[PDB]
Design an enzyme around this catalytic site. Structure first.
Site, short mmCIF file in Angstrom:
data_model
loop_
_atom_site.label_atom_id
_atom_site.label_comp_id
_atom_site.label_asym_id
_atom_site.label_seq_id
_atom_site.Cartn_x
_atom_site.Cartn_y
_atom_site.Cartn_z
N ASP A 66 8.10 11.12 -9.49
CA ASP A 66 8.21 10.30 -8.06
C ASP A 66 6.97 10.94 -7.39
O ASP A 66 7.07 11.98 -6.74
CB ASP A 66 9.31 10.47 -7.42
CG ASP A 66 9.57 9.23 -6.52
OD1 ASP A 66 10.90 8.86 -6.28
OD2 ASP A 66 8.78 8.83 -5.84
N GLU B 109 3.91 11.61 -4.60
CA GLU B 109 3.46 11.47 -3.24
C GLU B 109 2.04 11.38 -3.28
O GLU B 109 1.34 11.79 -4.23
CB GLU B 109 3.69 12.43 -2.46
CG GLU B 109 5.30 12.92 -2.23
CD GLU B 109 6.20 11.59 -2.04
OE1 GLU B 109 5.87 10.72 -1.09
OE2 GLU B 109 7.35 11.63 -2.48
N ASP C 104 4.61 3.84 -9.23
CA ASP C 104 3.83 5.15 -9.82
C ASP C 104 3.12 5.14 -11.02
O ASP C 104 1.88 5.47 -11.12
CB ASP C 104 4.93 6.17 -9.86
CG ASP C 104 5.84 6.54 -8.84
OD1 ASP C 104 5.74 7.50 -8.21
OD2 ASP C 104 6.47 5.52 -8.44
N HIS D 138 11.00 11.30 0.58
CA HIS D 138 9.46 11.46 0.47
C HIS D 138 8.77 12.63 0.05
O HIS D 138 7.66 12.92 0.19
CB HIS D 138 8.93 10.76 1.72
CG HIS D 138 9.24 9.69 2.05
ND1 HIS D 138 9.06 8.22 1.36
CD2 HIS D 138 10.13 9.05 3.09
CE1 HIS D 138 9.54 7.43 2.05
NE2 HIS D 138 10.27 7.85 3.05
N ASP E 185 12.78 13.48 -4.32
CA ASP E 185 13.04 12.08 -4.66
C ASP E 185 13.23 12.32 -6.21
O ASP E 185 14.24 11.48 -6.64
CB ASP E 185 11.90 11.30 -4.53
CG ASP E 185 11.58 10.96 -3.16
OD1 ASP E 185 12.55 11.10 -2.27
OD2 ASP E 185 10.32 10.19 -2.85
N1 LIG Z 1 6.30 3.57 5.15
C1 LIG Z 1 5.01 4.15 4.60
N2 LIG Z 1 3.93 3.96 4.94
C2 LIG Z 1 2.80 4.14 4.44
N3 LIG Z 1 2.72 4.88 3.21
C3 LIG Z 1 3.89 5.01 2.52
C4 LIG Z 1 5.23 4.94 3.21
N4 LIG Z 1 6.12 5.08 2.34
C5 LIG Z 1 5.35 5.76 1.27
N5 LIG Z 1 4.03 5.37 1.26
C6 LIG Z 1 3.08 5.87 0.42
O1 LIG Z 1 3.86 5.80 -0.94
C7 LIG Z 1 3.62 7.15 -1.64
C8 LIG Z 1 5.23 7.16 -2.34
O2 LIG Z 1 6.31 6.94 -1.71
P1 LIG Z 1 7.65 7.60 -1.51
O3 LIG Z 1 7.83 8.02 -3.09
O4 LIG Z 1 8.45 6.72 -1.06
O5 LIG Z 1 7.36 8.76 -0.90
C9 LIG Z 1 4.08 8.19 -0.37
O6 LIG Z 1 3.25 9.33 -0.75
C10 LIG Z 1 2.69 7.34 0.64
O7 LIG Z 1 1.53 7.75 0.10
MG LIG Z 2 8.52 10.15 -3.57
MG LIG Z 3 8.18 6.90 -4.97
#
Ligand SMILES: Nc1ncnc2c1ncn2[C@@H]1O[C@H](COP(=O)(O)O)[C@@H](O)[C@H]1O
Ligand SMILES: [Mg+2]
Ligand SMILES: [Mg+2]
Length: 200
Positions: free
Chosen positions: A15, A17, A114, A172, A177
């Site tokens: 997962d 970032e 991803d 996040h 995650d």
């Molecule tokens: N609400 C959001 N607004 C902008 N970018 C986001 C958002 N949520 C996730 N991302 C982008 O997507 C990546 C992967 O999302 P996540 O696995 O949900 O943390 C994050 O590290 C951000 O680069």
């Molecule tokens: Mg994540």
């Molecule tokens: Mg993710």
């Protein structure tokens, strides 16, 4: 049957970032690269790959990115760039025994982003080949939709809700995650689900 035989010796939970901003930064770049190696039958975590990654196109993390992910600048300063991290992954894969053709493993991600979008997009930008083992994966949302008969609305939070699981750690954070993915998988296997590749 609870915890049935599975089709894989190991599941590799990932997962990312990435850099981000409001409105979205372009291009995005991976800044956290976690992989949890799960025992294929029990879903227990047996090994962890974890590296933060130094972004290059937009090297300064935005306030939004640090607020979203908790990743501060000092965590990516001095880190190897994605090219080197991918080489570290290959070495970790080798040491874990995952490059044996008779050891079957597959990546598991929450959504397709991803490995369908983020990693191949950055590798294309950088002119880097993508290792073959990143080209097949299980989208946990889709797996969950077959296991539970329903489409989760908001990813890990709603899959934890549907399964009455407490959230692990911080949303996040890539490694946290991953722990939630692993916990959801363990519960789906407890209910009798046999995981299958979903990527095309
Ligand atoms: N609400 C959001 N607004 C902008 N970018 C986001 C958002 N949520 C996730 N991302 C982008 O997507 C990546 C992967 O999302 P996540 O696995 O949900 O943390 C994050 O590290 C951000 O680069
Ligand atoms: Mg994540
Ligand atoms: Mg993710």
């Amino acid at each position: 049957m609870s915890f049935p035989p599975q089709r894989y010796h190991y599941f590799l939970v990932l997962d990312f970032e990435a850099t981000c901003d409001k409105p979205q930064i372009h291009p995005q770049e991976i800044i956290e690269f976690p992989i949890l190696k799960l025992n294929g039958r029990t879903m227990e975590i047996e090994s962890t790959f974890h590296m933060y990654v130094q972004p290059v196109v937009h090297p300064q993390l935005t306030p939004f990115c640090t607020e979203l992910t908790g990743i501060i600048q000092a965590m990516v300063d001095g880190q190897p760039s994605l090219q080197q991290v991918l080489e570290r992954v290959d070495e970790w894969m080798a040491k874990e025994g995952l490059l044996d053709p008779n050891v079957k493993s597959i990546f598991v991600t929450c959504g397709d982003w991803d490995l369908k979008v983020m990693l191949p997009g950055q590798c294309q930008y950088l002119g880097l080949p993508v290792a073959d083992y990143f080209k097949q994966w299980i989208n946990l949302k889709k797996a969950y939709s077959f296991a539970m008969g329903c489409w989760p609305k908001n990813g890990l939070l709603d899959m934890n809700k549907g399964l009455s699981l407490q959230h692990i750690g911080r949303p996040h954070s890539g490694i946290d995650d991953c722990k939630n993915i692993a916990n959801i998988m363990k519960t789906l296997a407890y209910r009798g689900f046999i995981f299958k590749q979903t990527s095309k």
